[PDB]
């Protein structure tokens, strides 16, 4: 799809000529805002002392929190 005033929607990144918008890969990478990123950002995975509060989506990175012992 086409960029809007140079920008691609959340959950997308821009192509290598600045002309096209490409969807992030669900569960793999993300893009939170209207952007001119050349790729989506890789999702964070929680480290062992942490629980996943919400999963990575194309528009939102993983949210991790310590288990019963913050923080």
């Amino acid at each position, epitope marked *: 799809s086409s960029p809007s005033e140079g920008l691609c929607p959340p959950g997308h990144h*821009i*192509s*290598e*000529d*600045g*002309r096209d918008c490409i969807s992030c890969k669900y569960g793999q990478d993300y893009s939170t805002h209207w*952007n*001119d*990123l*050349l*790729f*989506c*950002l*890789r999702c964070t995975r929680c480290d062992s002392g942490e629980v996943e509060l919400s999963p990575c989506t194309t528009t939102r990175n993983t949210v991790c929190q310590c288990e019963e012992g913050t923080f």
Partner: antibody, heavy 126, light 108 residues
Framework: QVQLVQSGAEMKKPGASVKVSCKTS????????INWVRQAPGQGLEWMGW????????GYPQKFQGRVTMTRNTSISTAYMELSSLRSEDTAVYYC???????????????????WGQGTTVTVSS | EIVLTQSPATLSLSPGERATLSCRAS??????LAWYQQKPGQAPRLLIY???NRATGIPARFSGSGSGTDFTLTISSLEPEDFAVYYC?????????FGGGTKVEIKR
């Protein structure tokens, strides 16, 4: 012996165009992007855009759309940059430089602009 | 466009002294920042890619660090051949851009 060898210095009149060539050897030409970068006298580096020699896809900063064309001839492993409607301000050394990673490999497999041509001086004047 | 600010523009240091060069991006570029060196009348030369990875052929006294908006090129001890101009470069956002450069010159 990975090398990028550029064409010689050029003089141009305002309004003309210049075509600089960048001949590569020592690797598979089709496997790396070519970038063009210029430097006016006593100034910084300015990126001009890039080309995927494999698919012939290009992209240029908005400031250079219309004026910059990147082409390649795969059979001779050389990339070209053509700059049209030249002005005084286009007087610069022009460099080509390869970089690895395109499309779905660009984010994760990029190792910088690792080998550069020697540069081509272009003087624009009447 | 991402604006890369290299400040100060000139750094005056002695041979055998530590150098710390600053590159600041107008907005986060995560780890997608490269460093180049250029001596007068020579092509630029890659030093560091993706913020902290030293390139082949580059001596261990060069190292990059930082992420987001604040990046540092450190030269642990200046050698005569290290006095040159240094440029940072971001690759995360369209279009790719360079910083305006920092010249490291010899203090005497």
């Amino acid at each position: 012996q990975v090398q990028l060898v550029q064409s010689g210095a050029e003089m141009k009149k305002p309004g003309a165009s210049v075509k600089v060539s960048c001949k590569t050897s020592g690797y598979t030409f089709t496997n790396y992007k070519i970038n063009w970068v210029r430097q006016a006298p006593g100034q910084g580096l300015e990126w001009m855009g890039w080309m995927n020699p494999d698919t012939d896809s290009t992209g240029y900063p908005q400031k250079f759309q219309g004026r910059v064309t990147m082409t390649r001839n795969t059979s001779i492993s050389t990339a070209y940059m053509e700059l049209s409607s030249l002005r005084s301000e286009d007087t610069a050394v022009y460099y080509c430089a390869r970089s690895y990673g395109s499309g779905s490999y660009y984010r994760d497999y990029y190792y910088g602009m690792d080998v550069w041509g020697q540069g081509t001086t272009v003087t624009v004047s009447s | 466009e991402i604006v890369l600010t290299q400040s100060p523009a000139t750094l005056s240091l002695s041979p055998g002294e530590r150098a710390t060069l600053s590159c600041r991006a107008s907005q986060s570029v995560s780890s997608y920042l490269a460093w180049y060196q250029q001596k007068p009348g020579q092509a630029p030369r890659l030093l560091i890619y993706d913020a902290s990875n030293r390139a082949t052929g580059i001596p261990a006294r060069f190292s990059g660090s930082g992420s987001g908006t604040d990046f540092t090129l450190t030269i642990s001890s200046l050698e005569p051949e290290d006095f040159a101009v240094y440029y940072c470069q971001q690759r995360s956002n369209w279009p790719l851009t360079f910083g305006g450069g920092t010249k490291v010159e010899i203090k005497r």
